[PDB]
Assembly symmetry: D3
Homo-oligomer: 148 residues x 6
């Protein structure tokens, strides 16, 4: 099945939002196949954010995410990359709908709590970045009531 | 006042979602005028799904809903048929917004937890299908703070 | 497995507490094997309350419970009769602990929201009172993660 | 920082929705810089609703809001006027999305629970209407994890 | 009916716990007859804490409570003074049960979030301290489903 | 500050209870200083359960915990070892109070969802068992509103 990578960033961890966030994806029915808390390395942060490398805000992205603990997760399930994004909301928390994570909890583009993969393609890249293969679940059993 | 019919299907019952679902419509202010759990008969299931009778997925619809317990409800209140639908989300749970029932809990079109009437017209039909007149509340008292 | 009978009384129904209550027993892992809303008959109410027949408050018990809709439920699971009672709290809602149903929601002995069976013995009696055998689930499947 | 004025009207207070509403804006990260419960004066109600003065429904607006207690609040934070509106929903609760306040709790345009300022301009006016300067917090400290 | 005084102290306000706390007493069925946020005066703080005047920790109590905003409330209902205390927990949050306010949210005796009146006698005193008679609701209407 | 070790066992993970559990300790104010999901090794399981080595149920304990994924956590804060235990409940979920984790969610001694350290002494041992020193947070910053 599809897998995505989500990190709740230092601001989400510091605000005590980790469990609330995991519980939202668990209720949806996605399965947790990798999880750890870590303080990202500058090397890791720069690779993760490589797409924004030419833009002046790249260095801020890199400073913040290495500024404290991150909890890195990967979830598995049908259509999880796009669904996970729908559940986060949009870039600007102020513009994100009530009921989404950033819509419910966030106020600033610079402190928007959580990030998730763009695409199936960048998810594959990001998972291999943040996780070793031995840190990820091999045999996954979803609730039998979830999939036809 | 308007009435609609909602069934939480075998997958919603099995996942322990019944109370969560009723509590959403109670908080909104709709009044429960009929409620029961039952394992639908094939005769009942086929009439309920008669609209999809010509399509090949008709038989799957009929197999699943008779496969386990269903909790059948009817709610009363202004604009309840459309409102109830807004609160469920859309056919594809993956595409349903955060904050809706299928948006919050579901992943597969084939396991989308709950169904509700299309229209005032099919609600009237579906209620008479699933419920006897003596199983429905006659005198309804909504919260006095709900309606001008 | 053990079964118990719980009714959320007219005051709980009228206050929109039905879903909240069912969701508590679903989360605990007990399985719903019977459910319906009805306005109790005086004959039914008097049999249900037969134990208090000699006491002067018997008639009040009987008046209130027939005064509006009741949602009658039976749940199945290990030790459900005593557990269900632990989750309700004690007779006086004011004295019931935070976290219990009556502790969280109720204020008056006369409006204490829900009743549940005393014992396995009176549960058996009360279930046969309120429910026909064909209204109760025969084959029960609990979450496989609940029981060793 | 921006400030807005929100009142939960008599119907929201009477339905026990005050805490739920405040908790939504607290979780978002907006800071409470003024709060009180009062039964609005006719003079206050007419000024507050001055914009609808020419329309026939003006007098109903004025009757209802002075009909019971109101809890008047002002919140501070980036983009709070528009954000607060996004979180309330739209005029018609039936049409308001799941996850919004009116979408979750309300049914009637005439009983839509809460009102919030239109604009930064009318917020400034409404705050000075309902609150004395000494009733508002001067030094505000938001969670340090909220703003970049 | 009985009335009690509760203040959520600067630590509860700063942690965004105000709405959660009010919502607990609203769900229980107690009625809010007074509410405001204020930064307590030293004169007010010393009178409020007069009982601990001889003990060395008196001055700390007085320093903290005047250190930031407090939201002062009074609730009405049967047995509210003792019930409100049951719902808060005990002095030491570490020892307070799960399901109580201090049991759920607090860790330190010095930061225990909320205080409520000791007795009907000190409630009467504390209400007259913190509130003017014109700031309190005169005609109270509780949910009709609460009291027999 | 004190640290404790908690594991949500395979039954808690499989039931989608991970986020709910973390969110309870985050709300209390304890700080997450280590977190990962893993499928325990038999060597690890036997050391963890060494205290029950002579009893016949030792092998069952060891079979179950290595039977699926576990999410291993360590939390930091004043009095966290005893507090964490208070929040879990007692051995028998049926006997655990409403409001505790096992009281809210569990039914069987053999499937009681989560375990936490006995004492400060066994916490120290268990943390060194399950975690490498580099997997644990060194500089911890609790909410400034938590500790006097």
């Amino acid at each position: 099945k599809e897998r995505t990578f989500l990190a709740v960033k230092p601001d989400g961890v510091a605000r005590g939002l980790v469990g609330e966030i995991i519980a939202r994806y668990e209720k949806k029915g996605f399965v947790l196949v990798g999880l750890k808390q870590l303080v990202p390395t500058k090397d890791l942060a720069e690779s993760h954010y490589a797409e924004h490398k030419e833009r002046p805000f790249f260095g801020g992205l890199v400073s913040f995410i290495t500024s404290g603990p991150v909890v890195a997760m990967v979830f598995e399930g049908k259509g999880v990359v796009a669904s996970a994004r729908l559940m986060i909301g949009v870039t600007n928390p102020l513009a994100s709908a009530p009921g989404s994570i950033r819509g419910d909890f966030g106020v600033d583009v610079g402190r928007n709590i959580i990030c998730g993969s763009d695409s199936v393609e960048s998810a594959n890249r990001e998972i291999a970045l943040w996780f070793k293969p031995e840190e990820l679940l091999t045999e996954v059993k979803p609730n039998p009531n979830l999939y036809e």
